[PDB]
Amino acid sequence: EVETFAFQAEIAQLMSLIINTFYSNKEIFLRELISNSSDALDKIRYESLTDPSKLDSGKELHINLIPNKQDRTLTIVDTGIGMTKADLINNLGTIAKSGTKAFMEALQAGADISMIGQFGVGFYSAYLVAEKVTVITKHNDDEQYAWESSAGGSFTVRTDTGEPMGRGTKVILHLKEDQTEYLEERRIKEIVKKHSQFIGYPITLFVEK
Ligand SMILES: Cc1nc2cccnc2nc1C
């Protein structure tokens, strides 16, 4: 069972701008996704201070970066609080509607795309380097779901039957044909050291065959 939804008009415009605008500093996508992972790990850590049972779905708080050259996918896995079904379809889109507006007015006043995180819509920067994004997430209060969108104004949501996660968010970036540089170890190491050197969580960079 696959449910197809439509992006809000303002979010579809933001994805079209990210995809069509000429902007060479594409590497900032990883800092936005890592900062997203660090935020979700902060939420579940704070919530577990008044409820240790929230860590029953996994005590470890870390971030993993998994490149795969055969699938041409870059995966950012974190053991954060996760996202519910209400989050994927309505809550994030409601919040992103005002952050997208403020992000567009700033772009017309001199700002550039790299400052997208200051408006709380940095997740969509994944479409700088990805033709399709698949997000596997699991919250303590909801089932495991699979979010997918190749832009174009629509996205899908379904109950994930794959490998269980326990708790966290898994962002799979199906990279564009000319963006395979973000699968090489030295390139990912260079980006992490330059943009995410002080993340208060262990970041493990997986290696390939
Ligand atoms: C799938 C999704 N994951 C997000 C993670 C952080 C912030 N916003 C997000 N928005 C969406 C639609």
Curated annotation (Swiss-Prot):
Source taxon at top rank: Eukaryota
Modification comment: ISGylated. S-nitrosylated; negatively regulates the ATPase activity and the activation of eNOS by HSP90AA1.
Residue ranges of the region described as Interaction with NR3C1: 1-209
Binding site for ATP: N36, D78, K97, F123
Domain notes for this protein: The TPR repeat-binding motif mediates interaction with TPR repeat-containing proteins like the co-chaperone STUB1.
Known role: Molecular chaperone that promotes the maturation, structural maintenance and proper regulation of specific target proteins involved for instance in cell cycle control and signal transduction. Undergoes a functional cycle that is linked to its ATPase activity which is essential for its chaperone activity. This cycle probably induces conformational changes in the client proteins, thereby causing their activation. Interacts dynamically with various co-chaperones that modulate its substrate recognition, ATPase cycle and chaperone function. (Microbial infection) Seems to interfere with N.meningitidis NadA-mediated invasion of human cells. Decreasing HSP90 levels increases adhesion and entry of E.coli expressing NadA into human Chang cells; increasing its levels leads to decreased adhesion and invasion.
UniProt record similarity statement: Belongs to the heat shock protein 90 family.
Name this protein carries in UniProt: Heat shock protein HSP 90-alpha
Lineage: Eukaryota, Metazoa, Chordata, Craniata, Vertebrata
Whole-protein residues included: 16 to 224 of 732
